[PDB]
Symmetry: C2
Subunit: 212 residues, 2 copies
């Protein structure tokens, strides 16, 4: 009865060509082949050209053109529509995922759903900070900051639809940060080193190699 719905804000090329497809197409395939995800939605801007062809290659994915002006606004429109549309109940789970984390391992997606799927507080994938951290002033170190109990967040970020809608309605960064402001403490679930984000050539070399 309870569903798990993937939502991807994509309204900066997710249309870069690696292997035989785009980054986005590489992303949607990981969700489409996962048995535990019941539906995948992509929110693009009303002027996104390549979007129509993406829809054609993935007819069961809903490609919506109600992107806003910010990543925050485009996520807000996506969640609101799933609810108004009736496609998701207030108690179904929404997994918000970055369009550029196109190497997420299916086994880590399973962990996320298996461990935060039935928790009222939801959960995100994350990896413990393993290196010493430093604060910089103008190219110099002004201090060493304790890395005790610190984690770096990845995506997806899984939360009940009703809970997420409330939190995004109210200095926010990720979705968990808006959930934390309501008094809820989300779980931290082991992400993966392979789950990196495409935001620069160094990353790209590693992604391009992982996608082989």
């Amino acid at each position: 009865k309870r569903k798990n719905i993937a939502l991807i804000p994509a309204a900066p090329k997710q249309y870069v060509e690696i292997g035989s497809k785009t980054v986005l197409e590489h992303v949607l395939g990981i969700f489409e082949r996962h048995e535990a995800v019941d539906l995948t939605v992509v929110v693009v801007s009303p002027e996104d050209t390549f979007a129509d062809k993406v829809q054609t290659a993935f007819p069961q994915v809903r490609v919506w053109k109600n992107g806003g002006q910010t990543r925050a606004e485009t996520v807000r429109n996506g969640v609101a529509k799933l609810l108004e549309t009736g496609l998701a109940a207030e108690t179904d789970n929404i997994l918000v995922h970055d369009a550029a984390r196109c190497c997420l391992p299916s086994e880590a997606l399973a962990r996320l759903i298996e461990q935060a799927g039935n928790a009222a507080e939801g959960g995100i994938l994350a990896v413990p900070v393993a290196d010493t951290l430093k604060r910089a002033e103008s190219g110099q170190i002004s201090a060493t900051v304790d890395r005790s109990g610190l984690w770096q967040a990845q995506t997806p970020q899984l939360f009940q639809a009703g809970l997420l809608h409330r939190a995004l309605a109210a200095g926010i960064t990720d979705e968990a940060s808006a959930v934390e402001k309501l008094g809820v403490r989300p779980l931290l679930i082991q992400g993966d080193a392979r789950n990196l984000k495409l935001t620069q050539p160094q990353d790209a070399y590693i992604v391009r190699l992982l996608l082989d």
Copy 2:
């Protein structure tokens, strides 16, 4: 007579076969082929035996067997012995590198030598923290911590032999070499590292390491 650049690798796993060489042999390979490095030393435990084999593949590398009971103690002994021996002068540079960071880009090494190699305060390779940071209480988020201006330290960490010997000799609640230098009131430079300069500590890493070398 120019100021010298000496690599020091505390290695008392790094013997995980990859291709046709151990991780260690891969690491020695990066320094021995780099024009600006004048010497390379590896400090192992006296019990270590595979180290003898390493010595035969790298005749100019110095394999010392005065490892400590911890990484901090082995770095301390290597630096002391480099000075006591006369191989390093007080003002030569000591580049302290992890035995398991076998994918350090040659270009990254050059930048460190060029920028920190000529600054009395030394410097380290490091990358800015790009993802949102969270503090955990018992598997749950207890806070989001501000990442503005924050960096993750890598190796090598480059300091003058006399400044490094001084800083590691005696409070004690420190972590990397930079943090012992900072306690003296000195601020090391931060030089851009690289995403491939990762350390081999778990299977996820090994897959990426093996993949990056081919």
